[PDB]
Design an enzyme around this catalytic site. Structure first.
Site: not given
Length: 290
Positions: A117, A234, A264
């Site tokens: 991320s 996602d 995610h």
């Protein structure tokens, strides 16, 4: 008085480092019993902390890698007002400090990055700033593209206007159900007191937009080998960013794995996805170490 973590533990009781701004960062190590074959820095994402990487780090330590991490400024056990940063480059500068200290203690070992991320945008900017220095990079749903929903061109101009008027305005937290289809992992995320679930400050949303803009400019100079893992469903780091990274990065050694229907947090997803994630990272890093 001794400096303490935001949860009141003295830093003298914990592994730590002091960054270039004089702030304490909490550090975490997973050292194998023998001489390590390589080093790997683990870079967590927004609002989370290094303790979320326990199982992945133990798998890497089983391959004889010395795994190290810190909580980024403003996260987990490190200092700083929660989820704010004077400029996104502070995160990259602090990863480079920790990497430089660990290389001085283990001269000659190859160094890898693993990022998820926001921590994936940090790993990209870190490798871009020192071309030819890292042996490889593992990216799990990295932050590469402004979000199609929250950051259209109108919303980006709106965030820049808000940043001038109310930089400290807090925006709403994300719907935790978009993190993973694995309900148990969503419940663990909702009950970890070291995760910040307070919601985004406008001035931090601007730093995330600077990260995306910087990653886009850095891709044509990125030559480091990498493994990129991405979910097709996602809602936080849109899968289009993963295709864009494969196309614009100049790396001679680049691989993409798509997880159909996955959300995610791939390394905390349904058991079928998480098991393939750990196995794919294991095979990729084991082929590139000796």
């Amino acid at each position: 008085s001794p400096r303490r973590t935001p949860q009141s533990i003295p830093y003298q009781d914990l592994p730590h480092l002091v960054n270039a701004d004089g702030q304490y960062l909490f550090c975490r190590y997973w050292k194998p019993t023998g001489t390590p074959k390589a080093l790997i820095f683990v870079s967590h994402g927004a609002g989370e902390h290094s303790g979320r990487y326990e199982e992945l780090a133990r798998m890497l330590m089983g391959l004889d890698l010395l795994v190290f991490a810190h909580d980024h400024v403003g996260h987990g056990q490190s200092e700083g007002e929660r989820m704010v940063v004077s400029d996104f480059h502070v995160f990259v500068r602090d990863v480079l400090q920790h990497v430089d200290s660990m290389q001085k203690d283990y001269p000659g070992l190859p160094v890898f990055l693993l990022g998820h991320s926001m921590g994936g945008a940090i790993a990209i900017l870190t490798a871009a700033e020192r071309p030819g220095h890292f042996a490889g990079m593992v990216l799990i749903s990295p932050l590469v593209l402004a979000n199609p929903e929250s950051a259209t061109t109108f919303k980006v101009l709106a965030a820049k206007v808000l940043n001038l008027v109310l930089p400290n305005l807090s925006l709403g937290p994300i719907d935790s159900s978009v993190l993973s289809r694995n309900k148990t992992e969503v419940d663990i995320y909702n009950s970890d007191p070291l995760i910040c679930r307070a919601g985004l400050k406008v001035c931090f949303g601007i730093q995330l937009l600077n990260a995306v803009s910087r990653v886009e400019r850095a891709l044509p100079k990125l030559t480091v080998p990498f493994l990129l893992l991405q979910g097709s469903a996602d809602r936080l780091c849109d899968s289009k960013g993963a295709y864009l990274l494969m196309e614009l990065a100049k790396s001679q050694d680049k691989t993409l794995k798509i997880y159909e229907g996955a959300y995610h947090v791939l390394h905390k997803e349904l058991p079928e996805v998480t098991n393939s994630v750990f196995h794919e990272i294991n095979m990729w890093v084991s082929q590139r170490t000796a």
